Paper text:
Using the data from recently published structures of mammalian pre-mitoribosomal intermediates, we analysed the T. brucei maps and identified a number of previously undescribed structural elements. First, we detected homologs of RbfA and Mettl15 (previously referred to as mt-SAF18 and mt-SAF14, respectively), both of which are associated with Mettl17 (mt-SAF1). Structurally, RbfA is anchored to the complex by its N-terminal extension, with the C-terminal domain binding Mettl17 and the C-terminal extension binding Mettl15. Together, these elements stabilize the subcomplex in a way that Mettl15 and Mettl17 form a heterodimer that is bound in the cleft between the head and body. In total there are 43 hydrogen bonds and ten salt bridges that stabilize the Mettl15-Mettl17 heterodimer, which contribute to two main interfaces. The second interface involves catalytic domains of both Mettl17 and Mettl15 (residues 484–512 and 176–198, respectively). These data suggest that in T. brucei Mettl15 and Mettl17 form a stable complex, which has not been observed in other species. In Mettl15, SAM is located 42 Å away from the methyltransferase target residue cytidine 582 (C582, equivalent of human C1486), implying a non-catalytic conformation. The Mettl15 conformation is different from that observed in the mammalian m4C1486-containing post-catalytic precursor, thus implying a pre-catalytic state. Finally, we identified 13 hammerhead-shaped densities ranging from 17 to 22 Å in length, coordinated by tryptophan residues within a helix-loop-helix motif of pentatricopeptide repeat (PPR) proteins, which likely represent cofactors such as acetyl coenzyme A (acetyl-CoA).
Numbering used by the authors:
A (entry chain DD): 52 to 203
B (entry chain CP): 9 to 188
C (entry chain Cd): 10 to 49
D (entry chain FP): 2 to 175
E (entry chain Cp): 12 to 125
F (entry chain CE): 25 to 63
G (entry chain DD): 661 to 711
H (entry chain FM): 2 to 324
Amino acid sequence: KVDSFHANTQYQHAWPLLSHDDLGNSDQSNNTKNIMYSMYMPKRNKGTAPWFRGADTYSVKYCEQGRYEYQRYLMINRFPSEYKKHFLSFLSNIRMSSGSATIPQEALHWLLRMIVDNFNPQHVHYIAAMKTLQSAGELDMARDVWKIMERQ
Amino acid sequence: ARAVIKRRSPQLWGAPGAPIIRMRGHHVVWKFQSYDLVVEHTHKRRNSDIRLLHYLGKHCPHPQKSLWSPDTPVAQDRHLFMLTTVDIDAFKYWFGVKRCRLSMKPWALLAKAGLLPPSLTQNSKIMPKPLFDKESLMRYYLANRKDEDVMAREKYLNYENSMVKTEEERAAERPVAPYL
Amino acid sequence: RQIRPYYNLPSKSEHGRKMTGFLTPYRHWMWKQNELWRNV
Amino acid sequence: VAKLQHNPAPTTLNFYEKSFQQLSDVQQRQTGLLIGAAVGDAAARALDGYTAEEVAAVAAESGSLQDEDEDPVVFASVTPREHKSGLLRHHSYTFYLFSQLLRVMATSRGDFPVQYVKNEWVATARAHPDCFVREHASLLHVLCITMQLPVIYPWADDSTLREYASDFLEFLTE
Amino acid sequence: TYGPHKSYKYTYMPDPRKLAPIETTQRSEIVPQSIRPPTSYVPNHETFLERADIHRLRPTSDFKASFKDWNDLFTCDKRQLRVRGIPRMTRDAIRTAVQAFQNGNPPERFDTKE
Amino acid sequence: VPRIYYAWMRPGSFTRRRFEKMRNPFVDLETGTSLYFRD
Amino acid sequence: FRDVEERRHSRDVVNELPNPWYDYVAHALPFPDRDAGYPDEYGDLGQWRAP
Amino acid sequence: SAIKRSLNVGVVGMGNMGVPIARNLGFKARSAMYLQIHSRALSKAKRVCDDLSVDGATCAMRIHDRYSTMTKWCDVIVLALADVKASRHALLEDNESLIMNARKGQIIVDHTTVDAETSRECAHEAARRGAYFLDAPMSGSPRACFNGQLLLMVGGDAETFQKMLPIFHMYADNVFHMGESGSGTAAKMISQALVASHNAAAAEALSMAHALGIEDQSKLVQVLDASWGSSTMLRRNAPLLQDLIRNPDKTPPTSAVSVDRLLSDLAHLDASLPKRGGEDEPFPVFDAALRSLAAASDAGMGDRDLASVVHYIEAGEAELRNR
Amino acid sequence: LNVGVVGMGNMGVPIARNLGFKARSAMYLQIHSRALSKAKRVCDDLSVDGATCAMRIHDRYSTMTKWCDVIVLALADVKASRHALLEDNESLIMNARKGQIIVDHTTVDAETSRECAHEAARRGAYFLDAPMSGSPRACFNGQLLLMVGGDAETFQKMLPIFHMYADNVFHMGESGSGTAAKMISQALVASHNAAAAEALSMAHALGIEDQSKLVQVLDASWGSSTMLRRNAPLLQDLIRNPDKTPPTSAVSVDRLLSDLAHLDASLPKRGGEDEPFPVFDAALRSLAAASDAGMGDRDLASVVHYIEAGEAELRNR
Amino acid sequence: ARKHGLFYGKMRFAEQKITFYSDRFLFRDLVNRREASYANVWEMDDPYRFLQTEQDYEDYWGDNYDVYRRMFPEMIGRTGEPVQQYGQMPIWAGPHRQHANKSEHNWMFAEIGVNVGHEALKKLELDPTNEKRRRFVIRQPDGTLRSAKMSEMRAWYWKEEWADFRFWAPQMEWGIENTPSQADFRKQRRIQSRPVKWFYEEREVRWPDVINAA
Amino acid sequence: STSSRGILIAGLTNRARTQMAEGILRRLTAGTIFIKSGGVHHESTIHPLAVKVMKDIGIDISKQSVTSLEAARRQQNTYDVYISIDCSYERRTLDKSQPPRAEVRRRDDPVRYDPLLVPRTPSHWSVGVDATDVRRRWQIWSPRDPSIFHETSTRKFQDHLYEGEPLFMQLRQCPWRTQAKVSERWEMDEVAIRYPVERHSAHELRFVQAREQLLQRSFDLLTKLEKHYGERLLLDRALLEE
């Protein structure tokens, strides 16, 4: 009896192929009669409607830009005390001895973080990195440090 | 370290303690409950505006039917789906360099992704746990022991470095006739 | 947490904990078997 | 046109059956070279050493066939003579040495120096000395290994392909 | 045909994923549930239950009559355990003791009530 | 009054003409309609 | 355990296939390598908090 | 030659047990049938199609109001009506009846429980026409149809039975080939007799329990189930039987399978048993169950559940006294 | 606790063996017998096969009752059970303690259980009756049906003891409902066997040849029963070859009729001159006709030949 | 499909974007795209040459046609991407834990963080040719690790409901107007990809010198 | 005249191994006892290779039928034996289109493990539920229900696409094997699905070799059941000699 009572009061037969709109306008057949009804709808909705920007695309620059092309050169300013603090911290991190919990690659990593943070590594930082990597036996990494200096 | 301890949520080694991957829930009926893999302190901070250290991802514990069945149907692609988003780079950062802790529920969830081995508590009820004998273990080790240099080089490749240049690459990088 | 099996040294004290926390030498041995399976 | 499933017929036969539909026209042949080489080698494995008269004898002996059951030669159930191990149970040494080059090419993602695979091939040779002496410096062996290279760039002039393959042929003929 | 559109297979144009089949598989397909036979230490389910009873708020020993046999105790899941009418804590204690026995840890723990 | 009332009942529209027909089954649509909304 | 597992894994063929999730880390840097469009350095009509 | 096509399967009855068959076929066709839905009331047929479509089918559906269109469209037909009279009207008696108008190779299956002679005539005239007829009485509730758990006792050509197994397995779990030409009807007849006997036995047993003073009906059912004697009919009717005995004034509920249904089914047995010359009375307990069910039906309780027999055992005995 | 077994018939010795085996010295075991040599033999056999608890052997109900806490009777006949429980001078229930428990497993009348329970309640003890159904091999293996009727808390106290020799133990209610459960179960078994005979005879009359398939059809349909599932494979041959004598079985027509003989006494009145029992009475008619034909000890599948006689008494009476 | 009493409308433009009459370069781009585009594309044209089998034809055109046409807005010869598989890392626990990772459900994981999850970069982030794909992974209920299919990968971004039935890229003009012209991180990336078995073994590698054969 | 209330033979499919086991048990018991063989998925047909291989020994299972044991699940407490035929959990593959995987070899191409470090399943342990111990639970959430049609209804397996869910299947557990008096699990590889390249002769040889194991297993089961009930069940005993 429940199935007998529960009839299809919800759905309606689909749209035929070339059917019109509920306002009577149509595309490719009814032209300049079609009206725009986006201004009758409420100005704001408290949650995106199923048709909210469903089809939206972006420029091809976004998908064809190279990597790191968008980074703009801005000069970060900091106090001289901050400069001294950060330079000493980076030098200590570079000079941290390997073996226990740090691996020799970490000296090069900490040299590169100086660059990525918009710091100018000093000749003392370069000397420390080369010395530590040579003492660890990473001569190729030492030459990599030299090449980083030159590229800077 | 409180005169009267928080009886219902005790911990180890005080606050805020080491970072930990927990599977945080929401104050919602189970019917909509979903979890989020977050990195946080052992003693949950509900004082600062910063509740957690990093948001690794989200997990939906309710299976969803495969909406993608027609697309190149592969073996058993119609089984229900359990959706999850995971930050693998941040997870590797916090797991490796920061040596944070990992709860068993997140460990089991991540073992499904190929990022970690099956958990210690994901024990099959069938096989009993092993029984060890020093003599048999020694016999096996001697029977097939690796050699010093191969063992050391495998360890070095796994932990210390993986970009070791060949003689050919060193020669290619080596500068050429003009020398300027 | 630490398991207190019924068969370790009991403290015959009525002013504290009724079971001590020591253990029989068998419990020492089997605990290693669990320790090793955890170590792998 | 879909028939009634009185039995639990499988929706898809192979994992990559539907994946091969999603390959461009040229990519289908690019992949087909490698997959067909593997399939042919795996079909020929069971009868690798058999002479022409012996394969004919196998075909004659296996004379029970249904409508389209199978041809006895493609994956013959005849017991092989040499017991092998690892992949050699299903593929020849030439294809063993072929697959390592395929893997190196796949991980390399395009053309690459021969040094990326010199050592893989040398380890294979050290592992299987008898097959190494039996098949090394052979025209068939070298050509079978080297048919791969064009798939790195299906349309390149003969000069480009030959200069590219000169290094691999150098090492395989040394 | 039933629908007004004699041209459409489905008159209501349901989403083609409404009709997508849903396959299924049971945890039994993956792993079985073996039953660990009673030992001399806990010969029967009542002994198991009284051994599991250690806590004053988890009176597992009050429900020896809630299970028919060793296998009935060991096969009943959390849902049937609740249906039989057991408190939350006693239910969880019974389930955890059974699972520990399955994993190889018998119910051997010191009664903390005193 | 609905929010799309004006689009629905704008004179000369398909919906407005249908309403006019259903209100008077045998009007002359070219001249039998009303410009205004007033009832 | 490790040695038996490693010999088994090497002798297995399917698991020799590469795994992008376990093999490497991609972009361990603090910032994206390309511009996703954001940020928008301009307010909005409903927004009074300009800076 | 022919053209690749999807076999046309039609469903005729659509009673309580007819529409579940169509729903199962529509859900499980997977676009291989182009199902047909015949009904005397085209409103009823269209309602079935609309509900099935909104619930979501996997095949197209065609509504039918008269048997000629069904004959010409369907390749296979399944017919599940209420009464043997309606089955006869559809299959043989009507001017445009299916069997009387069957095409070469067409297949017809009946699930309505009809008489052995009716099935024999249907199969014989179908064979004359050249088509094939399988008499496939079914057992199981509409709930069992929804779950896909029905018994089918098919009698007919083994070739056609094997060909039609894929369609049967869409709404019937236990499908057996009892033989040919009425074997299924005989099996269903025996099953109905057994059901009646066991229902009477269970009613008497639970009355015994109440009289002896047992109120733990669930525990009694458990003991019987684990013990040497227990029937599916007792397990089915036990709760209702106790609920109905304990308060004797309570009117029995109405169910799809009813006393009139059993009586109509057993009338075919009364017709088909032999030894009319010896007045065919060798079955005492079956006679007693028939008596009690007849008393229940005469009591105006013929539309209710089979459990109503409790209130009418003694009425049947009084009728026996009146002999 | 001290549990003592007194029955020691043919079905009682397995109870004593199982109690001794599974006691594991956790509960004390007592054995009583009418003759001491038999009980000495039983204790010797149990010890030779393994005895965990010291066992004591009794010739007298006085010692039996004044020593043990639980008494378990597994006797042969109602008269023997009544002798043990009430009418004896050293009667167990008469001399019962204020707290000891007595259980009876022999199939006695509802009224017998009534007097037993009433006297136990008078003396302050708890008596609950648990008629048993099964085979002696089922007792050996530890499978039995016990349907106990009595106090709920005492039943709970008795659960562990029962499981030592029983698998399926149920509580049918208070005041000796176990005997009613056993009695009604037997009546229902007889009725289902009769109905199965009818169905198979009718199938043969209709001329359906393949009974192998019809057995599964009936088992999967409604109205199925274990009695059909059991007697079908024999009945098929027995109806097509009515000449062969039905084979002997442990469960017999005489046993069913003896166990049904308590129904008349347990029912309220027979003077109504009518049967409020159509199916059950029809089954009884055929069972009695089979017994009077010299086929009493044969199988339960013999109802087919005497169903026709099951109508003569209905017509004449 | 529609429901009762909702009076659905019609959408005239797929998206809100600047018209092509507003710029000389947008006008030229549209003219070139139209010339490279069809006007009416049928089941026989080039874009459908990937339906090489009659079963492919029937399954594409019979049902789930909406799904197939919506899997990608642009018109290509694939309607999807091939799947592949990944190797499972060695479990040192062994057969004690080989039973894990087998479940009743497909587990899908999609990567997030910086450099991932940007809508503007969608076509580049799920492009197989990109070194930095989003690395989706599916674990099957039988423990298999596989990549994701194009639709599963595309389901993790914002909805995109439109199609292009007339632009077919291969017929773009070439050689008249369209005549395209032209640190050690790349070496380091090649080193990363390169096999490293040589570390265990100018001392150039040579074939084995056979000893048993002498 | 037997004391057994029946024996069930559960399987995932009821095509080849369950049918052959039913035939062998029926022949050995000479039809004196009830045997019901069922599978979880009934949408199948008895395999012609199974029929031919059973004929080669003398039993024709051609009359039997593929059916599921849903009816017997409601009565599971009455049947006395619960044989369950299934594949090994180690070689099991959820993809029917592949040969079985390799077992774990204990103690050189396969890696052989230590029996102490990787112990086997103890044989004295019983099985609670195997793959053959499940029951189908059909369900449907129609949009015609006004509570399921509402936008915020959780009776769905999706969101934003449609409402409700058409007829779908789910498998429940039936942990009642142990309720039976004799429950056993028989480990046999699949035989009803042909490997990608197999030839009919080898596909039939697999059926034959599985028939041998089914025969021996049924003989052992009947011996232990004879010891259990105490009666004689190997009434035929004509096949074991060969």
